Amino acid sequence: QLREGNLFAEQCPSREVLKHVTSRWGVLILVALRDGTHRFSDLRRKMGGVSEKMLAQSLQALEQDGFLNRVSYPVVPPHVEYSLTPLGEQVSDKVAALADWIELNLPQVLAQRE
């Protein structure tokens, strides 16, 4: 279906894309790669609290969405490296503006919760 999405529609696939890019690991992946290529072990390092499995699972959902390049190096020690595609750069700009806004306006939000 080559339509534009409608998030208000029950079962539009944009809801899935939205979930992938704003899940707690998807956001961190997308913000981190703005700095450049990272190996699996570099992401896993910055993101305290993520298991291997859940990281593999976000990285995979983001790659099949078209946001990441994944390059294998079977050479010893083996690594897999990740970077953003041009499409992935766009969404990442949107995710980062939001993440930044939140980090910056947190004290007013916390001062609200009482």
Q: Which tokens is 24 given?
A: 């707690």
HSE toward the beta carbon, residue 31, CA cutoff 13 A: 16
Please choose, out of 34-42, 51-59, 72-80, 104-112, the segment that lies near its own copies by the rule CB under 8 A.
104-112
Sites for Cl ion among residues 43-82 (CB under 5 A): 79-80
Measured from the CB atom, the residue of 71 and 106 that comes closer to its own copies is 106
Terminal CA-CA length for the chain: 46
Q: How far is the CB of 71 from Cl ion (least distance, A)?
A: 10
What three-state secondary structure class fits 66?
coil
Does residue number 30 form part of the binding site for its own copies (CB under 8 A)? no
